[PDB]
């Protein structure tokens, strides 16, 4: 017959004080040229393929990176800013309302995109539980 | 008369253990059109207002997103960006500081604005507290 | 001789919930002007210093701050935006890889920067340890 | 006619002189255990009758040993010694005064009896009394 | 002239045979109480004097039965027995050996007596004595 | 020619009345230390030998006093008492079962005796005989 | 005238020759029993009353043969053959000195007669007278 | 022829005076001593035969000398006289009646006789007788 | 001349008849008393002197009656008699055979004598002689 004396104790619910947390903004800005013709100016649906660009230096493209829901993305028409309504970009070509153009003009597309990044540096303190004996 | 017996003890406080955050960024960039003429030119400090502006496909504007320090706006003339000392842009008008323009320079208006949003994904672990039984 | 219990407890490891987490972005865009001329002019390699700019308010300039990895900045010839072939811009000058430009082309610069702080808002709550009590 | 002569005699009171007593005591401690759960506890009467009870080799009992005119009980409650409030053991019980705790506690009673053994060793010696001789 | 004859007689010391004794003992213990404080603690003679202590249902005690050459006392610290190094128990207070202890420590004394009566029952049987006549 | 008279006589057994005895009682408690750690601890005949022990005033001990037939002694196991089933104290050690407990673990064991004397006070009072004189 | 011779003669005296004569003595012992007790002790008259006697074998005796001038008697108390001092016999009783006894006594009275007879035997031889004339 | 005168003569018859006689007494008192044992009670005739005596000088006798007519004899018991109830002497023992005593009761008998011689000293003296002469 | 007869005569010797004695006998008995003691017990002569006796009316006596030929003593030792062997009486003292006595024990002597006196009452009768003449 093996007796013990029988004790029991709780404990409490400690509580978090503080924190630091540090973050870093990654942008990042896509060139693409455009040499527009009349080859393609059909009075309507006016849509540059996405192979007739070109690229940071000189290199054809052959897709176009949509903007997602963190980017953004601007149309310039004889290097003049041209609103979101002649301007809708898709991965094939570049809606531009209808044909209402001239001859070969230096037409210039920006597209951008955003990423970030964070992480904790100084981690919060943990107040001490407190202990109740039960007898 | 009754007897317990009377025992005590205390608690540590405990200590976190790593973590780690996700960050992401939403961008905004908003674009609206100006006819600007000689109606209402005055020279020296010149003032186009928030309602002689079309907007986006075509819809008439009636004020302008004054840039609080979370985004940025720029003013092009016939194209050619100007910096700041020809730009203030109030919610009613653009303060223009040149007098002197042509008849119908194409002018445009590219405000911006960004926002973001992180949670928490790895919940950082709390380190096991020492006790200690107090006779 | 003086004698007390001999007991010992031994606690749990804590366990963290919820977590909340607000963030800021902050954009900066610098303007800088410039008016280039056939006396900086080599015919390819134009290394237009960084004095021979204006700057913001008609303020004389200084140096040209490199993008860093949290930046970005485009290159305008006569307001048409130009690839990466005609901009690689250093702290004294901009690379202009070729010349073939005409009498004081409106040349023009834009900087941008992104900074970003977040803070802990609600900090996450601590479930309470587990006591067992040896004898 | 038969005659003899009439002759009395008395005797006196012998005087004893004491001897030597020898004595034995035998001591007798008895060990009960018990388990004091939430079963009875009644905030008052809260009683074990004679069967909740162990042995000295885990035998279970059948009634208690009633401290009589020659013995002494005590009552522990958790391994410390409780006066007479908490205790007033009968043959078929133990009736505590209130208790309150958690499930069954060690409580100990030691029950305990002492008997005697005696007898003469040395038996006194008896002195000789006195004869006087009446004629 | 009264002239009687002369008879003188002696006697023997008788001789005692048997006997037998029956025996009692009584037993006796006392229960008080402590309830140690702070002002026990001083790093020297620690002692409850005299009326500082409970008694076996409530009502306070004012002196201690001394241990006699016929009884034990026992030293409850916390439910642990103590020996003699901690017992010195005078008619005044407990001199325990010095001040290092706690708040609370659940301290009770146990004294014992103890008494015996005893009688003779079979009262011892007389032999009977020789009277030899002298002439 | 001597010639005496010839009588002979008769003694009776006489009869004694009653006494009085007077008895003490003489316990002895002996209080014996013990600090059980590990250092034979094998689940099973766990056994502290001989001088792993105290007395009294530290004053480290020999042998056990092995309770005869004329006293009594309890096993101590954290403050709570053990019955027969884990003791049977030889002169050497004890007759633990098993045991699985922390190191150090206050046990103590008491040892009881008891001697009494006795004297017998007032003696017991001789009736005096009857003589019968034959001629 | 007758005429006769006138002659006278005288004669002598004769005398005795011894003589032989023969005696008897007749003795009687007389022998009276007693048995004196304190229904009659007085202080200096006990005198047993002449019939409180017993005589030879049964007869009780009436009274008593006072010793006359040719006996003698002798008195017997407790087998003492005491003098005449405390005895004085008469015909009534015996004057037993005084009152010194103690309970009943064996005492006997002896009483003894002496008478005398004798005859002559031989008668005494008488000598011849002598005779003489005278003419 | 012888012739003589006729004278005749008578005598008177003279008468005798008194005289003188003396007279002895002679008595003889002889003592024989027996000790009576349990070898002869029968409740009656315990009879000591001549020869169970010892005599005067311890010269054991054969036989009894009867008193006749001249003697009287006392029988002894235990030194108390008796009565003709428990004595009558014969040549051979005595007659007591029942007996009972214990052995050695010492018993003496006293037999004594009387014999008596006396002479004629004084010679009577007679008178001288008468002489008458007839012629 | 003067002429005168010549006669003789002769007488006879008469006889006697006749003769009446009477007798008397007169009895004396001495009666002497003793306390003797151990004060002169020498062994073989222990014999008490003269006036060591105590006589009839406790008269002190000078010597002793020695036993004559007229006469009888009995020795009285304790009552019992005795015989010749303890007794032989002369003017001073007995003639015990030994010491071997008690202390004070009761001995009595008595002496008797005798002596007897007669007279002649009737005298004898004388026969008339017979005297013859012879012429």
New interface residues.
Partial sequence: ?????????????????????????????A???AAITAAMIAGGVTTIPAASF?????APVAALPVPA????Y?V?I????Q???LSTLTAVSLALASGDFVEGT?V?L?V?T???????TT?????????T???
């Fill in positions: 017959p093996v007796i013990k004396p029988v004790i029991v104790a709780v404990s409490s619910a400690p509580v978090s004080t503080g924190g630091v947390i540090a973050t870093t903004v990654s942008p990042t800005v060139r693409f040229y070109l690229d940071d230096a000189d829901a963190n980017g953004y601007n310039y004889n290097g003049i800013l609103q979101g309504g230096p210039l920006e951008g955003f990423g970030g990044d964070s992480t904790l981690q919060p303190t943990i107040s001490a539980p407190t202990i004996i039960i007898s």
